[PDB]
Design a protein around this ligand. Sequence first.
Ligand SMILES: CC(C)CCC[C@@H](C)[C@H]1CC[C@H]2[C@@H]3CC=C4C[C@@H](OC(=O)CCC(=O)O)CC[C@]4(C)[C@H]3CC[C@]12C
Ligand SMILES: CC(C)CCC[C@@H](C)[C@H]1CC[C@H]2[C@@H]3CC=C4C[C@@H](OC(=O)CCC(=O)O)CC[C@]4(C)[C@H]3CC[C@]12C
Ligand SMILES: CC(C)CCC[C@@H](C)[C@H]1CC[C@H]2[C@@H]3CC=C4C[C@@H](OC(=O)CCC(=O)O)CC[C@]4(C)[C@H]3CC[C@]12C
Ligand SMILES: CC(C)CCC[C@@H](C)[C@H]1CC[C@H]2[C@@H]3CC=C4C[C@@H](OC(=O)CCC(=O)O)CC[C@]4(C)[C@H]3CC[C@]12C
Ligand SMILES: CC(C)CCC[C@@H](C)[C@H]1CC[C@H]2[C@@H]3CC=C4C[C@@H](OC(=O)CCC(=O)O)CC[C@]4(C)[C@H]3CC[C@]12C
Ligand SMILES: CC(C)CCC[C@@H](C)[C@H]1CC[C@H]2[C@@H]3CC=C4C[C@@H](OC(=O)CCC(=O)O)CC[C@]4(C)[C@H]3CC[C@]12C
Ligand SMILES: CC(C)CCC[C@@H](C)[C@H]1CC[C@H]2[C@@H]3CC=C4C[C@@H](OC(=O)CCC(=O)O)CC[C@]4(C)[C@H]3CC[C@]12C
Ligand SMILES: CC(C)CCC[C@@H](C)[C@H]1CC[C@H]2[C@@H]3CC=C4C[C@@H](OC(=O)CCC(=O)O)CC[C@]4(C)[C@H]3CC[C@]12C
Ligand SMILES: CC(C)CCC[C@@H](C)[C@H]1CC[C@H]2[C@@H]3CC=C4C[C@@H](OC(=O)CCC(=O)O)CC[C@]4(C)[C@H]3CC[C@]12C
Ligand SMILES: CC(C)CCC[C@@H](C)[C@H]1CC[C@H]2[C@@H]3CC=C4C[C@@H](OC(=O)CCC(=O)O)CC[C@]4(C)[C@H]3CC[C@]12C
Ligand SMILES: CC(C)CCC[C@@H](C)[C@H]1CC[C@H]2[C@@H]3CC=C4C[C@@H](OC(=O)CCC(=O)O)CC[C@]4(C)[C@H]3CC[C@]12C
Ligand SMILES: CC(C)CCC[C@@H](C)[C@H]1CC[C@H]2[C@@H]3CC=C4C[C@@H](OC(=O)CCC(=O)O)CC[C@]4(C)[C@H]3CC[C@]12C
Ligand SMILES: CC(C)CCC[C@@H](C)[C@H]1CC[C@H]2[C@@H]3CC=C4C[C@@H](OC(=O)CCC(=O)O)CC[C@]4(C)[C@H]3CC[C@]12C
Ligand SMILES: CC(C)CCC[C@@H](C)[C@H]1CC[C@H]2[C@@H]3CC=C4C[C@@H](OC(=O)CCC(=O)O)CC[C@]4(C)[C@H]3CC[C@]12C
Ligand SMILES: *[C@@H]1O[C@H](CO)[C@@H](O)[C@H](O)[C@H]1NC(C)=O
Ligand SMILES: *[C@@H]1O[C@H](CO)[C@@H](O)[C@H](O)[C@H]1NC(C)=O
Ligand SMILES: *[C@@H]1O[C@H](CO)[C@@H](O)[C@H](O)[C@H]1NC(C)=O
Ligand SMILES: *[C@@H]1O[C@H](CO)[C@@H](O)[C@H](O)[C@H]1NC(C)=O
Length: 926
Amino acid sequence: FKFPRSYAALLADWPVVVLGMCTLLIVVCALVGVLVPELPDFSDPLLGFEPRGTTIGQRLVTWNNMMRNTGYKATLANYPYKYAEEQARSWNFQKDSFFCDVPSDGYSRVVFASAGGETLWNLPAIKSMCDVDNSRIRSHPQFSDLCQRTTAVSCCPSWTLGNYIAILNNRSSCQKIVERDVSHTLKLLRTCAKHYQNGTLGPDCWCTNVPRKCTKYNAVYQILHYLVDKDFMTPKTADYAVPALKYSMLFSPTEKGESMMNIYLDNFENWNSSDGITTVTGIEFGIKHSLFQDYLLMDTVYPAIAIAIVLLIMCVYTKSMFITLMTMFAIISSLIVSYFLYRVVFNFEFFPFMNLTALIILVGIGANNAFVLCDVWNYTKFDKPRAETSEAVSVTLQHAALSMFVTSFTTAAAFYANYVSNITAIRCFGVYAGTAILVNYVLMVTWLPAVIVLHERYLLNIFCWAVLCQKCRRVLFAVSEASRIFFEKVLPCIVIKFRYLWLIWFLALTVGGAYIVCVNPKMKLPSLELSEFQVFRSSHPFERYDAEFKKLFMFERVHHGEELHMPITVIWGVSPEDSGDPLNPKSKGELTLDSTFNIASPASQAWILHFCQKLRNQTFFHQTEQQDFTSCFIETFKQWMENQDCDEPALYPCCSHCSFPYKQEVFELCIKKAIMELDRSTGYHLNNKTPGPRFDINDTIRAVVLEFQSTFLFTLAYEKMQQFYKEVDSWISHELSSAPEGLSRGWFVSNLEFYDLQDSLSDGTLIAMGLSVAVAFSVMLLTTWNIIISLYAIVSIAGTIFVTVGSLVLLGWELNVLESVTISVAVGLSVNFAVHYGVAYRLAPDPDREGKVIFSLSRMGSAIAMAALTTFVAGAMMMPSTVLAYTQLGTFMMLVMCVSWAFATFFFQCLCRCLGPQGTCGQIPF
Ligand SMILES: CC(C)CCC[C@@H](C)[C@H]1CC[C@H]2[C@@H]3CC=C4C[C@@H](OC(=O)CCC(=O)O)CC[C@]4(C)[C@H]3CC[C@]12C
Ligand SMILES: CC(C)CCC[C@@H](C)[C@H]1CC[C@H]2[C@@H]3CC=C4C[C@@H](OC(=O)CCC(=O)O)CC[C@]4(C)[C@H]3CC[C@]12C
Ligand SMILES: CC(C)CCC[C@@H](C)[C@H]1CC[C@H]2[C@@H]3CC=C4C[C@@H](OC(=O)CCC(=O)O)CC[C@]4(C)[C@H]3CC[C@]12C
Ligand SMILES: CC(C)CCC[C@@H](C)[C@H]1CC[C@H]2[C@@H]3CC=C4C[C@@H](OC(=O)CCC(=O)O)CC[C@]4(C)[C@H]3CC[C@]12C
Ligand SMILES: CC(C)CCC[C@@H](C)[C@H]1CC[C@H]2[C@@H]3CC=C4C[C@@H](OC(=O)CCC(=O)O)CC[C@]4(C)[C@H]3CC[C@]12C
Ligand SMILES: CC(C)CCC[C@@H](C)[C@H]1CC[C@H]2[C@@H]3CC=C4C[C@@H](OC(=O)CCC(=O)O)CC[C@]4(C)[C@H]3CC[C@]12C
Ligand SMILES: CC(C)CCC[C@@H](C)[C@H]1CC[C@H]2[C@@H]3CC=C4C[C@@H](OC(=O)CCC(=O)O)CC[C@]4(C)[C@H]3CC[C@]12C
Ligand SMILES: CC(C)CCC[C@@H](C)[C@H]1CC[C@H]2[C@@H]3CC=C4C[C@@H](OC(=O)CCC(=O)O)CC[C@]4(C)[C@H]3CC[C@]12C
Ligand SMILES: CC(C)CCC[C@@H](C)[C@H]1CC[C@H]2[C@@H]3CC=C4C[C@@H](OC(=O)CCC(=O)O)CC[C@]4(C)[C@H]3CC[C@]12C
Ligand SMILES: CC(C)CCC[C@@H](C)[C@H]1CC[C@H]2[C@@H]3CC=C4C[C@@H](OC(=O)CCC(=O)O)CC[C@]4(C)[C@H]3CC[C@]12C
Ligand SMILES: CC(C)CCC[C@@H](C)[C@H]1CC[C@H]2[C@@H]3CC=C4C[C@@H](OC(=O)CCC(=O)O)CC[C@]4(C)[C@H]3CC[C@]12C
Ligand SMILES: CC(C)CCC[C@@H](C)[C@H]1CC[C@H]2[C@@H]3CC=C4C[C@@H](OC(=O)CCC(=O)O)CC[C@]4(C)[C@H]3CC[C@]12C
Ligand SMILES: CC(C)CCC[C@@H](C)[C@H]1CC[C@H]2[C@@H]3CC=C4C[C@@H](OC(=O)CCC(=O)O)CC[C@]4(C)[C@H]3CC[C@]12C
Ligand SMILES: CC(C)CCC[C@@H](C)[C@H]1CC[C@H]2[C@@H]3CC=C4C[C@@H](OC(=O)CCC(=O)O)CC[C@]4(C)[C@H]3CC[C@]12C
Ligand SMILES: *[C@@H]1O[C@H](CO)[C@@H](O)[C@H](O)[C@H]1NC(C)=O
Ligand SMILES: *[C@@H]1O[C@H](CO)[C@@H](O)[C@H](O)[C@H]1NC(C)=O
Ligand SMILES: *[C@@H]1O[C@H](CO)[C@@H](O)[C@H](O)[C@H]1NC(C)=O
Ligand SMILES: *[C@@H]1O[C@H](CO)[C@@H](O)[C@H](O)[C@H]1NC(C)=O
């Protein structure tokens, strides 16, 4: 084909070649990306929330692998199974005055409130609950088969006040009851409220120290413990004029689980939840996460509206459909090419649901690039209106391709910085967004200028409804002038005239941000446990169950408030190595057994026994009065040997006669005898959790695990949990340094999964900050070449972070997973506005501060404002969503927009006006 002597001439001369080449290369990526890599799945929205490389993580996955692999013939067995061959060679309640069970979690249940009225205790509300149960749940066909029935005729009653009250007044059903029953039951509860709080009127009855009449169907306990707000009856029960019920819970005689999915979708999901007298306000059918997949897809409309509005804006700004359509096509196609790269070339086997949320980011920064290019192109068409097309292209690129790089590169580098995190979902998201930004940048340099050539080559030729078009052209020209004089005079006037106000005002706002984030109420690590994470909008009937009602109903409030000790576990022979893929959350290593290990050497037998007793002196050991003969198994073996009198040839190696550091071989024999005996000397059977030795397929000892209870208690609170971990690990890790060989390389673990996420979120955040700020500062130097300007730019950027993070703290964000990503992103999104003002301030020909800033503002203000405004409106478009991440990104985009725009237009322009380098002293040579 024909040859042009320059790239800017290839654009001018054969732009169609560029478009053909690019559309080909999009479409082959679309094809391979659809065909070859398996489709992403969000049926588990938590899937990659897992720190990997962390020492606690490697220990945990190793331990988890041991539990998984332990079992009969398989590797790392729990008994000496080869030796275990040798031992073989050697409805109407006034009849139906009972419930099919006492309810619990594991049943499907709902929580009622009322839209008005101060107590649910009134008869109409009671009847409303049993009515709406019938009308929403029992009315469904499938329920009749889901039921924990006793007969087909009427399968089983639910648990609700409406049923207990009936039995307690010998009525047939909820529909028969009267306010005499309600008052009589209220008298029962007001009498029996005191007994229940003590626990004297306990769960099992029909208790013993309490009047039998209070507890005849065992009912009172169940009512107060399951059905009713813990605040309904209290020590103030009689101090209340009448007790007030804010909430009640109702239990279906059907499972909490996937089986409910139809009934929810059928009868709950899009009802107004109400009869006014009552409202369902919490629901737990268990389907919370399994519904997510479907919900995410319903919400993608909001992203689609965001794109449709970003189109409209770019049309109005560019005065063409065509440039706006082909830019939008480029923006979209970059997600396809990057998706191809991410699955195929980079060979990542997993794609977090979060990556879809990067679309709404990338359309914002896509429009940002489109603005500065079309703007500078139009500057060339004004600065040099008569030009040859390739020359005009060249000078446009000489200007724009640099600035449009550093918008993009700083933002990509902020997303790739999240690859430093130990968390797989974050590392993946940080890479996908990073590539899609850079792919989009390449299209904005190759594809887009070719379209600008086509626009001048052809598209100007094409030209009541007959005049309303002209009305609009007139009016939009009027705003083009009003906006022009606003930027070219008014905004500079505002900034200079009140410079001193703007400086202290924004400065105080940053201190507010810094105080809020860093001291009070300090930015907090997540403290709902992972298996209960929020995924829907906080108003949503599922989220209110985990968020509010688990605090309020006694069985929940107690069961999740109960004390459990940390099972301090210590392990040897298995190495603490994770050999899985550090990005694919489906992958894990197997075991890796260590040839240096043994226990049968008498030196080991001595040291390990001694070590348990040393482990028994440490302050953190909870010395139970109950004795676990599997904790420190070797003691149990020692005393068993000592109990073993000898009167047979077979028992000579296992004689009590021998000194405790036994010969390795007789240890290796007698240990098998002792443990295989445990099926007979006790009824207890081992399982994969059970402490003790562990076996080869041919029952050499390959490993051993010991376990002990802490003084400490299980908690989600990072500080207390950290105190526990650091103490116990430090002591064990020190003490192991004393051990004879092979025991030299043990390690410790216990129920620490949620702690390791918290500890990995803070470090993963902070380091991705330090990295993203460092790169953002380097770009600031490399563009402005003036250390003074860069210092101010960095101060303003830092200020935006403190105000955004501070306001997100006040909005009540934990440092949970998505949120902890966004904080790095904020650095990338913030920096580019300060870069634009920075370069324009140097490029000002004016000799003085005021001239320099006036030039910078008048030159950039429109394009900056569009970048902010488009991103902001795209963000706002996510607000109506139902999925939390969509709304969470939404708030964040709006907020970081205003804040970064405000600091970049005001504060940064004070520091230039009020302190800017007008002498050359801040400048550095190439
Ligand atoms: C993502 C995909 C759908 C993008 C596909 C790009 C097309 C819409 C572009 C590529 C080349 C363009 C064409 C290049 C040349 C011409 C010839 C031109 O015809 C004339 O009458 C003038 C001919 C001349 O003197 O050059 C009108 C515009 C048109 C059809 C252009 C219309 C838009 C086209 C087909
Ligand atoms: C809620 C939204 C969807 C309604 C309002 C949006 C309009 C004000 C936008 C949408 C597309 C835009 C148009 C895209 C392309 C052109 C071609 C161009 O046509 C000409 O004949 C040149 C006239 C001139 O510039 O003087 C003039 C601008 C115009 C009408 C744009 C003006 C502003 C428009 C009508
Ligand atoms: C970066 C963006 C622009 C692209 C990201 C990849 C998408 C092309 C993937 C992500 C999730 C996928 C969806 C996940 C689930 C479903 C339900 C599925 O429903 C069925 O009836 C088939 C069920 C099955 O066999 O899996 C149809 C495909 C679809 C929409 C998938 C189509 C391809 C999707 C949209
Ligand atoms: C990873 C790959 C696929 C990206 C490829 C993109 C390039 C083809 C783009 C990026 C920036 C563009 C450049 C932006 C600015 C200029 C400067 C301009 O002027 C000079 O080079 C003057 C040199 C002199 O001083 O003599 C000529 C076009 C050129 C190189 C552009 C040509 C096309 C470039 C190299
Ligand atoms: C893997 C991909 C994403 C990397 C792509 C990087 C390039 C697009 C960068 C690297 C070096 C940059 C170039 C370094 C130096 C120059 C010379 C510069 O020449 C000028 O005339 C400067 C003075 C002036 O603007 O008047 C114009 C921009 C240009 C080509 C830069 C444009 C953007 C470039 C090609
Ligand atoms: C907008 C335009 C300029 C396209 C974007 C350019 C690049 C960002 C992409 C597009 C297709 C990619 C290529 C697709 C296929 C291959 C084959 C691949 O071959 C190997 O032997 C891979 C071995 C392996 O690592 O497994 C090497 C990378 C390469 C050239 C890729 C490098 C990056 C490319 C050039
Ligand atoms: C609920 C949703 C559907 C509401 C959508 C409202 C938008 C259509 C409004 C909100 C803000 C408006 C914008 C406010 C500021 C500007 C900048 C203004 O810029 C200039 O006039 C530049 C003139 C030039 O230099 O050529 C053009 C109109 C525009 C994009 C406005 C067009 C109409 C916008 C996008
Ligand atoms: C480089 C400067 C000039 C600009 C600002 C960037 C960072 C220094 C800021 C942004 C977000 C802040 C972080 C937000 C959240 C946390 C988690 C927080 O973790 C805790 O365990 C707090 C106590 C608890 O949760 O009980 C410790 C501080 C830290 C890293 C903050 C410290 C200061 C950070 C890293
Ligand atoms: C993904 C990798 C390739 C990124 C590497 C870091 C980039 C941010 C660096 C690499 C080369 C640098 C460029 C090398 C040379 C120059 C020329 C230098 O002087 C001029 O051209 C003056 C232009 C003007 O007056 O603004 C301006 C900075 C610039 C574009 C540098 C900007 C920052 C660049 C693109
Ligand atoms: C006042 C001027 C300066 C304009 C400010 C921006 C507005 C154009 C838009 C953008 C985002 C919008 C808000 C986005 C979300 C909501 C939440 C919505 O309320 C709820 O979701 C909470 C209901 C509850 O639980 O009480 C009420 C409208 C509101 C405040 C919107 C009101 C109009 C806002 C501020
Ligand atoms: C002018 C520019 C800035 C764009 C304006 C976008 C608006 C069209 C958005 C911003 C806030 C949105 C509102 C934010 C919150 C809600 C509550 C939401 O309440 C529900 O019942 C659904 C959620 C639930 O199930 O709890 C219904 C949509 C609505 C009114 C949204 C409708 C669309 C609004 C007004
Ligand atoms: C002149 C304008 C364009 C500049 C100032 C912009 C503000 C009006 C924006 C920036 C951030 C926005 C907020 C970002 C996040 C939220 C949370 C959102 O949800 C709730 O507040 C739910 C909980 C509650 O109701 O307390 C409601 C909208 C709100 C306050 C937004 C309202 C509009 C705000 C304050
Ligand atoms: C969403 C966040 C990131 C803020 C984005 C920047 C806005 C604050 C800018 C963009 C366009 C600006 C507007 C452009 C033009 C005008 C007309 C201007 O009109 C006059 O001064 C009066 C003229 C007369 O005499 O009739 C008043 C300010 C206003 C609304 C500007 C107010 C500030 C705006 C909305
Ligand atoms: C353009 C300039 C002025 C900077 C950007 C606008 C800020 C001043 C906005 C952006 C987000 C706003 C915050 C968004 C959410 C909230 C939560 C809201 O509720 C609470 O703090 C309740 C406190 C309590 O219960 O006592 C009060 C307003 C506040 C702090 C807002 C205060 C004003 C903020 C920081
Ligand atoms: C309860 O109802 C039954 C009839 O269904 C009746 O025999 C009985 O006397 C009633 N009263 C009591 C206290 O059980
Ligand atoms: C909607 O909610 C109100 C709450 O008062 C309730 O009265 C009404 O019956 C519900 N359903 C319909 C169809 O209006
Ligand atoms: C410390 O442990 C040894 C056995 O390891 C025991 O004899 C000694 O009494 C313990 N000391 C204290 C203070 O508990
Ligand atoms: C015993 O098991 C080990 C590892 O499982 C294996 O290498 C060895 O060959 C086995 N020996 C016999 C005799 O089964």
